[PDB]
Design a protein around this nucleic acid. Structure first.
Ligand SMILES: Cc1ncc(C[n+]2csc(CCOP(=O)(O)OP(=O)(O)O)c2C)c(N)n1
Ligand SMILES: [Mg+2]
Ligand SMILES: [Mg+2]
Ligand SMILES: [Mg+2]
Ligand SMILES: [Mg+2]
Ligand SMILES: [Mg+2]
Ligand SMILES: [Mg+2]
Lengths: 92, 86
RNA sequence: GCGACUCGGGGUGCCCUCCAUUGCACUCCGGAGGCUGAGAAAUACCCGUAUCACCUGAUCUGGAUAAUGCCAGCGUAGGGAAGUCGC
């Protein structure tokens, strides 16, 4: 896949609240770069997943490569580059 | 706000199920790497459950502490650390 | 001041217990049962100049709860959709 400012994370523990996820996710991923936002959805379709939007793309690679498979609340987490830019990015 | 940087750190999202006594010990170890520790305050109120303070002798210490352990797994729950107010 | 009509604005969460789901979103709602609410999915409810819906602050603060804007604060904050008819 092509690099993107946004990394796609899944296999997340589904019982974690949107806000703890956001908060906790900012914890794991700050290191790599300035984050613009973390988008969580618990809707059947999008539960257990999340999108982390990075100001820099070097940052996302820097994150995905490093945090790949790393533990998160009792279970690993998968990371890939998002398939397409996020709105907040697109318009730039 | 502004996260104003000082020598004490405030961790939260800590595992509520763990004995506060053991928790303090596990907190001393894990953090005694970032320098001198003047004291660790683990919370005891059914409202402050899951949080604690780590008072470092030096401020720089607290800074590396935060950074490094930020989001670090601890009893199946990523730590979250910031500076304590004032 | 209530109230109609017309058109428009808006939110849809939490899990002490179960089942289903590994899902590429910004077109913002799975099933049972439980909680709050007017409303947590229906063109249902609510609202249209507003200290009288809702948003942004807020990944905010304080308290409670199984848990959640559940209750406070912030909040005379910054935004936010009007004409017509009738007593
Ligand atoms: C489907 C659904 N939509 C909306 C609500 C209502 N709702 C969700 S958040 C909120 C009010 C929050 O007010 P708040 O922001 O806490 O006032 P503040 O503390 O900012 O002063 C309401 C009424 C509901 N109970 N169910
Ligand atoms: Mg139900
Ligand atoms: Mg508010
Ligand atoms: Mg609160
Ligand atoms: Mg309120
Ligand atoms: Mg109350
Ligand atoms: Mg207001």
């Amino acid at each position: 896949t092509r690099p993107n400012h946004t990394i796609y994370i899944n296999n997340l523990n589904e019982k974690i609240k949107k806000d703890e996820l956001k908060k906790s996710l900012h914890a794991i991923f700050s290191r790599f770069g300035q984050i613009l936002d973390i988008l969580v959805s618990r809707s059947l379709k999008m539960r257990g997943q999340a999108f982390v939007i990075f100001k820099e793309v070097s940052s996302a690679t820097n994150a995905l490569r490093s945090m790949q498979g790393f533990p998160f609340y009792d279970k690993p987490m998968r990371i890939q580059y998002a398939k397409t830019d996020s709105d907040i990015i697109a318009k730039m």
